[PDB]
Design a protein around this ligand. Structure first.
Ligand SMILES: [Zn+2]
Ligand SMILES: [Zn+2]
Lengths: 109, 109
């Protein structure tokens, strides 16, 4: 898993924030001027693997996403998560996108 | 708050799912063929109002989002949350978008 390897610094990335639980890094193919990926260090494949037993942990991840977003994007930010084929999920390790740095489009998908 | 009123059925909506904690309804200006809004019935203004004290509740909301998404969008779905001006947040009551029903675009914002 490329995201487990990035989180453990086996594959290089430009680190925005890291702690015992999460790892955040710049997206190398950005769609916004600020485009950050936030991953749990623990491998969970997608949002469809959230259970009642790990929902408190995923809430903590989302809280830490908000702390990164409000620091990096004081003018506002969008959080995106992709599940499966129609959403274009490329890596099967849950990753939140933080998008900001401009007035973001809201266009037909 | 228009979303508190929708959640309490004071303003009509097309309901997808409802329980003691959450309310989900069709977006009337959709950007995808499946476009569902999911709100907590409790008023929380945005993701920037997540705290360590409510992070477990927001994890539960995200779990219920995933249950709606995997049912309505078995081929995959995207979850979006907008915070503040640059993201275009229009209603100050936290709302998750579930987008699906086609191979979704990933375009420059
Ligand atoms: Zn992984
Ligand atoms: Zn409200």
């Amino acid at each position: 898993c490329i995201f487990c390897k990035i989180a453990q610094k086996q594959i290089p990335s430009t680190i925005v924030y890291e702690d015992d639980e999460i790892f955040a890094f710049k997206d190398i193919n950005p769609i916004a001027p600020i485009h950050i990926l936030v991953i749990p260090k623990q491998h969970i494949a997608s949002l469809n693997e959230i259970t009642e037993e790990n929902e408190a942990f995923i809430g903590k991840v989302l809280y830490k996403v908000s702390l990164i977003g409000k620091k990096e994007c004081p003018e506002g930010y969008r959080v995106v998560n992709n599940i499966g084929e129609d959403a274009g999920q490329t890596v099967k390790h849950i990753h939140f996108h933080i998008l900001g740095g401009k007035k973001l489009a809201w266009d037909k998908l």
